């Protein structure tokens, strides 16, 4: 049988007539049916419109807050799933990009780290209870200390503490504790001061809290658990970035499975760009908008710039979407000055205007963008509906 497929504008309607005689209307897969997504866009676009402007540093990192927030919020609106899964995933990738180039001190950074790490849909919860000594406890004990999850760690230690308690007890006094450098002293004083095969597992654990690279790789189960571990327990510097990230990757490979893990590596590597083509695949919108921040911090209609490309190609999504309240975003984003003019000039035609206010706006454009050909004809639909009225009042 011979299919056939005609296109838009969508807002959920493309036709698929075939062959017997049925007419099949159909939406563009993964297309965002407007939703509360309509609200999210504008919210970013306000962050966008607010940035027109050291001072640049601070202000940027702030706008990152804005953006990050705006996405955390939209993600809720959704939970209350596909669209949720691949949204959350954008978040963690993007929850990374902040921790690495948008904090530069000592307090806020660790938070974002821990944050970025555990918020990444990783929950041993059913398995905490599936462990309730032996091997399994030890592996887990440390995995918690790695992901910075200290209160959890302790909680699960409460199991069999009783029966060198003098050190155990002490360790908890220290784990409860985290200048921090003074901390690591106390942690080692104890490691060195320091009956069976269990007695051995114990020294290990002390090395993990002390930051024994070889060991933060022993009880680490995923390249990022180590990466984090190091940062938290070994020595916290970002100038050691590239080396923390290399050791970890030789130890335990990365998942091609989850389309989030790889991107964050590239974030830690400096190779940013390799983010944006993945980002789009998840949500074209936020990708276009992370692209921009990046550029902030740091006749040719494309390959003008890489960030200036997901902008214009995101605008062109909305102009085939139909949301009358998002065009002020399209054209807002879109504004070479003579080129824009020719682009605006073929877009404005398709604006779904209704209110006199809507038209009050559309004109507000023609003024600054000088598209007189565009108003003249408007005047004719407007002029016409008026005549239709007169012709009905006289009757």
């Amino acid at each position: 049988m011979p299919l056939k497929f005609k296109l838009g504008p969508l807002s959920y309607q493309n036709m698929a007539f075939i062959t017997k005689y049925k007419l099949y209307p159909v939406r563009i897969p993964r297309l965002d049916t407007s939703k509360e997504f309509s609200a999210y866009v504008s919210g970013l676009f306000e962050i966008y419109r607010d940035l027109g402007d050291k001072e640049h540093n601070a202000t940027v990192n702030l706008a990152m807050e804005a953006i990050l927030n705006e996405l955390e919020v939209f993600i809720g609106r959704v939970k209350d799933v596909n669209r949720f899964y691949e949204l959350e995933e954008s978040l963690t990738v993007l929850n990374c990009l902040r921790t690495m180039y948008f904090i530069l001190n000592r307090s806020e950074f660790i938070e974002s780290l821990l944050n970025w790490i555990n918020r990444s849909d990783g929950e041993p919860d059913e398995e905490y209870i599936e462990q309730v000594e032996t091997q399994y406890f030890w592996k887990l004990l440390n995995q918690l200390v790695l992901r910075g999850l200290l209160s959890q760690a302790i909680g699960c230690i409460e199991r069999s503490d009783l029966l060198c308690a003098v050190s155990f007890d002490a360790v908890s006094d220290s784990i409860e504790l985290l200048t921090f450098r003074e901390w690591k002293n106390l942690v080692l004083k104890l490691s060195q001061a320091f009956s069976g095969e269990l007695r051995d597992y114990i020294e290990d654990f002390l090395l993990v809290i002390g930051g024994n690279q070889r060991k933060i790789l022993q009880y680490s189960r995923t390249w990022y658990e180590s990466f984090c571990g190091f940062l938290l327990y070994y020595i916290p510097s970002l100038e050691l970035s590239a080396e923390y990230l290399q050791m970890s990757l030789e130890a335990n490979v990365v998942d091609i499975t989850n389309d989030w893990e790889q991107p964050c590596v590239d974030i830690i590597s400096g190779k940013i760009h390799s983010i944006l083509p993945v980002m789009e695949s998840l949500d074209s919108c936020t990708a276009a908008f992370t692209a921009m921040i990046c550029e902030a911090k740091g006749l040719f209609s494309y390959r003008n710039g890489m960030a200036s490309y997901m902008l214009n190609s995101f605008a062109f999504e909305l102009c085939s979407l139909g949301d009358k309240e998002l065009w002020p975003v399209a054209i807002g984003l879109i504004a070479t000055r003579s080129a824009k003019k020719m682009v605006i000039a073929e877009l404005l035609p398709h604006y779904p205007f209704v209110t006199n206010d809507d038209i009050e706006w559309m004109l507000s454009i023609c003024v600054e963008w000088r598209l007189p050909e565009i108003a003249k004809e408007i005047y004719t639909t407007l002029g016409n509906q008026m005549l239709s009225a007169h012709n009905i009042i006289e009757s």
């Binding site: 049988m1 011979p2 299919l3 056939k4 497929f5 005609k6 296109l7 838009g8 504008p9 969508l10 807002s11 959920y12 309607q13 036709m15 698929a16 007539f17 075939i18 062959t19 005689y21 007419l23 209307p25 159909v26 563009i28 897969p29 993964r30 083509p277 390959r303 890489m306 490309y309 190609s313 062109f316 999504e317 102009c319 085939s320 139909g322 877009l347 398709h350 779904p352 004809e377």
Partner: protein
């Protein structure tokens, strides 16, 4: 059922069934179902072509059938009738409003008819024909330099100003759809040799080709998402990479 089209906005949709009469639907701004506006029997041979006109003038439909005719229709009710052909017509499409209101058809014969409807009164439905010459084929217009692409059996030509100016190389079999990128401009075709080709024209020609038999190909207005549909029994949609090779985003099955 050989064709189905859209108005300038996306509300109505005209369909020429297997049955000589041509339906026209529209969906309610209230609930999304597709409702019938009118249905009437014009030509005798199952219609194979259809287009809507630009609203710069009003609301009009052009049909094309194997009764060697093409007719203009307003609100519906017939206006004018074109019977220059000595052979059935296979395809029809209104030129882009940007030039005005002209038309172009193609049929079994080989006559590239271009009926231009004009007048300083601006409102007359009078139409004289400017035609020049080169089974299954079709044709497509370019929106912006008055140019249109044409598909014959296994061939693909590009005319300008009726003055040939470029041909599209490749098709190893009978072509089936021709679409001009809404805009350098680019064209797409659904060949029978079982593959989709995207050619890129500047000011010359290139190609970026992706692999049953392809049948119908479509663009949208922006994001320039292409539509391959074929005997595979599915529909695929393509976007452009940062570097212009097209890649498939997602697929729809009719298993």
């Amino acid at each position: 059922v050989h064709d189905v089209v859209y108005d300038f906005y996306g509300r109505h949709v005209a369909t020429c069934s297997s049955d000589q009469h041509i339906k026209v639907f529209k969906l309610d701004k209230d609930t999304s179902n597709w409702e019938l506006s009118d249905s009437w029997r014009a030509h005798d041979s199952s219609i194979v072509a259809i287009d809507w006109a630009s609203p710069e003038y009003g609301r009009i439909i052009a049909s094309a059938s194997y009764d060697k005719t093409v007719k203009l229709w307003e609100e519906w009710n017939k206006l004018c009738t074109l019977n220059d052909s000595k052979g059935s017509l296979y395809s029809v499409k209104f030129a882009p409003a940007h030039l005005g209101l002209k038309l172009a058809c193609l049929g079994n014969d080989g006559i590239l008819r271009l009926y231009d409807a004009l007048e300083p009164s601006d409102l007359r439905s009078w139409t004289l024909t400017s035609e020049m010459k080169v089974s299954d084929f079709c044709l497509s217009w370019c929106p912006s330099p008055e140019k249109l692409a044409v598909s014959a059996l296994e061939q693909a030509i590009i005319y300008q100003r009726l003055h040939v100016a470029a041909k599209l190389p490749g098709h190893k079999s009978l072509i089936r759809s021709i679409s001009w990128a809404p805009s350098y401009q680019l064209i797409a075709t659904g060949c029978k040799d079982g593959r989709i080709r995207i050619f890129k024209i500047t000011e010359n020609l290139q190609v970026e080709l992706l692999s049953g038999e392809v049948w119908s190909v479509s663009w949208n207005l922006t994001g320039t998402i292409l539509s391959s549909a074929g005997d595979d029994g599915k529909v695929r949609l393509w976007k452009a990479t940062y570097s212009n090779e097209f890649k498939c985003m997602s697929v729809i099955t009719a298993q």
